[PDB]
Coordinates of C-alpha atoms in Angstrom, one line a residue:
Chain A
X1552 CA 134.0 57.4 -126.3
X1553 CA 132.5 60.4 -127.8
X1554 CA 133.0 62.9 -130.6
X1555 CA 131.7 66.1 -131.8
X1556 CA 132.4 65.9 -136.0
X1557 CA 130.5 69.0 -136.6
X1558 CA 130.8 72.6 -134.6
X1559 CA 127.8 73.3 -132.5
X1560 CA 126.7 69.8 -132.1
X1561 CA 124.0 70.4 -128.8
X1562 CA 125.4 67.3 -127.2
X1563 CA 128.5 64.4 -127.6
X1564 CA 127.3 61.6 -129.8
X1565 CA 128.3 58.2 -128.9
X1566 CA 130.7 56.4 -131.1
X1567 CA 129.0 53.2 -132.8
X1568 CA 129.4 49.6 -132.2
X1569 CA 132.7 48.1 -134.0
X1570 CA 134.4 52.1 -133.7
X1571 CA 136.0 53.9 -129.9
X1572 CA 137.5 56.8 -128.9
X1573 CA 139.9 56.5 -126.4
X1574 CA 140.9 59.2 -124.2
X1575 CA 144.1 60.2 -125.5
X1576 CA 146.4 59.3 -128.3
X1577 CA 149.0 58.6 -125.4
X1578 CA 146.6 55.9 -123.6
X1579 CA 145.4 54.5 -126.5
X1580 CA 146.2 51.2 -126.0
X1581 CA 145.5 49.8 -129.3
X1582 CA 146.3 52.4 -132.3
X1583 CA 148.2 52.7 -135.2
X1584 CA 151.3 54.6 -135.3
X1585 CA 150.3 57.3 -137.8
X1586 CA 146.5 57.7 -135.9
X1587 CA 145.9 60.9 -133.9
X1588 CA 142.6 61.4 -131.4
X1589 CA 141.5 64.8 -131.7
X1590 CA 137.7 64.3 -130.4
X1591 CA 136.2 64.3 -134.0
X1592 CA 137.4 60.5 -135.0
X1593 CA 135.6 58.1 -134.4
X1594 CA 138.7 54.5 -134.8
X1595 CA 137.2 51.6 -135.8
X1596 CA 138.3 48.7 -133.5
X1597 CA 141.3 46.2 -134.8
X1598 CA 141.6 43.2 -136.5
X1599 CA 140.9 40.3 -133.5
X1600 CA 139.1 42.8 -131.6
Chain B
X1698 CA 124.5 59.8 -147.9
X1699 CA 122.6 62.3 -148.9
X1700 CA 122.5 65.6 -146.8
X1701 CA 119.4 65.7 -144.7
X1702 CA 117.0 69.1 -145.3
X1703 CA 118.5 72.1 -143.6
X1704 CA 122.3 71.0 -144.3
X1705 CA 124.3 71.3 -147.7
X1706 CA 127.6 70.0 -148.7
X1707 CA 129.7 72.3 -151.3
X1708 CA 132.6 70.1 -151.4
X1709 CA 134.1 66.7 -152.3
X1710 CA 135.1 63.7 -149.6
X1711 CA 133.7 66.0 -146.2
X1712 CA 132.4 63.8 -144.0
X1713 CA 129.8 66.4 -142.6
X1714 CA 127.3 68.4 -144.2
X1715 CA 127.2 72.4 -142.9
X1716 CA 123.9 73.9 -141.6
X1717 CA 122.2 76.5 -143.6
X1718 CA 122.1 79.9 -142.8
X1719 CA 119.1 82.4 -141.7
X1720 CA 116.8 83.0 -144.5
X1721 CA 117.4 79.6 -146.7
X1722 CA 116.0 76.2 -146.9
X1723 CA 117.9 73.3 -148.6
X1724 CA 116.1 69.8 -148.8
X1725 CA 117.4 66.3 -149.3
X1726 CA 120.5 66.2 -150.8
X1727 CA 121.5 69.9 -152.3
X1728 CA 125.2 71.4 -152.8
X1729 CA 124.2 74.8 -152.1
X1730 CA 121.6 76.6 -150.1
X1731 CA 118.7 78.3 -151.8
X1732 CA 117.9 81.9 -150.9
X1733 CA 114.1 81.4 -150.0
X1734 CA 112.1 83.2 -152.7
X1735 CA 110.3 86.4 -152.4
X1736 CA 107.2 86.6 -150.1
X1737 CA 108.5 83.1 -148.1
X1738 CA 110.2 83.7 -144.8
X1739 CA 113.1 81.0 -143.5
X1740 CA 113.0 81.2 -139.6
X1741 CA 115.7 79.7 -138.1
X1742 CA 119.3 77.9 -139.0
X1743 CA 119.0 74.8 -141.0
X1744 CA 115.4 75.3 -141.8
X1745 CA 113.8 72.9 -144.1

């Protein structure tokens, strides 16, 4: 649920309402198949969700 | 958006803007850092 875009960044910033972050690209329950989490992406949440 | 004072952006499509260095100031916007002018002192990273 948070993300670091920028190196040095004093503290995780939350992700913003409508995106998520999920813990791992494995346990990502609802991703497409060509999107990676790296901890710098903020996904914006699905159509019907 | 434009790159808040401090920050600069010397590139096309990056979705963050990179703090300036010791001794320059940037303000809104910018794509490049200015090297304060003689007689002004910058202080710290990013200053305004």
């Amino acid at each position: 649920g948070y993300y670091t875009d920028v190196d040095g960044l004093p503290i995780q910033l939350p992700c913003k309402p409508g995106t998520f972050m999920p813990f791992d690209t494995a346990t990502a329950n609802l991703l497409d198949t060509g999107l990676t989490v790296d901890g710098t992406q903020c996904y914006t949440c699905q159509t019907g969700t | 958006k434009p790159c808040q004072p401090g920050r600069y952006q010397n590139s096309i499509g990056q979705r963050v803007c990179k703090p300036c260095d010791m001794g320059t100031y940037s303000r809104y916007g910018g794509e490049l850092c200015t090297k304060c002018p003689a007689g002004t002192v910058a202080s710290k990273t990013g200053s305004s």
